[PDB]
Design a protein around this ligand. Sequence first.
Ligand SMILES: *[C@@H]1O[C@H](CO)[C@@H](O[C@@H]2O[C@H](CO)[C@@H](O)[C@H](O)[C@H]2NC(C)=O)[C@H](O)[C@H]1NC(C)=O
Ligand SMILES: *[C@@H]1O[C@H](CO)[C@@H](O[C@@H]2O[C@H](CO)[C@@H](O)[C@H](O)[C@H]2NC(C)=O)[C@H](O)[C@H]1NC(C)=O
Ligand SMILES: *[C@@H]1O[C@H](CO)[C@@H](O[C@@H]2O[C@H](CO)[C@@H](O)[C@H](O)[C@H]2NC(C)=O)[C@H](O)[C@H]1NC(C)=O
Ligand SMILES: *[C@@H]1O[C@H](CO)[C@@H](O)[C@H](O)[C@H]1NC(C)=O
Lengths: 68, 48
Amino acid sequence: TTAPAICHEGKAYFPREGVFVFNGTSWFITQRNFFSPQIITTDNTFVSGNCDVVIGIINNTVYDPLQP
Amino acid sequence: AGWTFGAGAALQIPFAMQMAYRFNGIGVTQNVLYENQKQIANQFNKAI
Ligand SMILES: *[C@@H]1O[C@H](CO)[C@@H](O[C@@H]2O[C@H](CO)[C@@H](O)[C@H](O)[C@H]2NC(C)=O)[C@H](O)[C@H]1NC(C)=O
Ligand SMILES: *[C@@H]1O[C@H](CO)[C@@H](O[C@@H]2O[C@H](CO)[C@@H](O)[C@H](O)[C@H]2NC(C)=O)[C@H](O)[C@H]1NC(C)=O
Ligand SMILES: *[C@@H]1O[C@H](CO)[C@@H](O[C@@H]2O[C@H](CO)[C@@H](O)[C@H](O)[C@H]2NC(C)=O)[C@H](O)[C@H]1NC(C)=O
Ligand SMILES: *[C@@H]1O[C@H](CO)[C@@H](O)[C@H](O)[C@H]1NC(C)=O
């Protein structure tokens, strides 16, 4: 199952490379030609705009690696 | 299926998402397609 973007804290996160997919439990970002799910973090995404404009945006959570 | 058609089994893909792929293949990020999807679709339909 896919989504074009993730809505997180009011911002739309697009996949930097690859496609956002759901494996039945969690959302992961993976590459189009070979399934290998990655954790969706702020490194694997491109933020642009608000959540109102994208059709099909989903309420997932994007991980922040700087948290201690 | 899109471009997946010419390389192994065809893989279904939402049409707008294959367009995002195609936009991102010309240097324009996918953000343009999703934010301006209505205008892009209207220009396509008018051109036809
Ligand atoms: C969806 O992805 C999650 C996380 O990668 C998978 O959950 C793990 O499954 C293994 C194998 O059973 C367990 O050892 C881990 O402890 C699980 N992790 C967590 C956080 O629960 C899940 O199995 C995948 N589901 C499908 C259908 O692919
Ligand atoms: C993401 O979550 C927000 C809430 O934080 C959802 O927006 C609410 O939708 C209900 C109707 O189901 C309205 O009554 C609320 O007023 C809305 N709240 C806000 C702050 O807008 C939003 O629909 C969810 N998005 C997705 C894709 O599931
Ligand atoms: C790019 O220019 C086009 C027109 O050539 C703009 O699209 C039109 O915008 C008007 C409002 O100003 C609408 O009434 C028309 O229906 C729109 N038409 C189409 C797609 O045929 C478009 O908004 C401009 N885009 C940007 C990013 O500036
Ligand atoms: C997909 O189509 C359904 C109607 O069958 C609609 O409710 C849903 O919002 C659409 N999703 C996207 C991403 O266009």
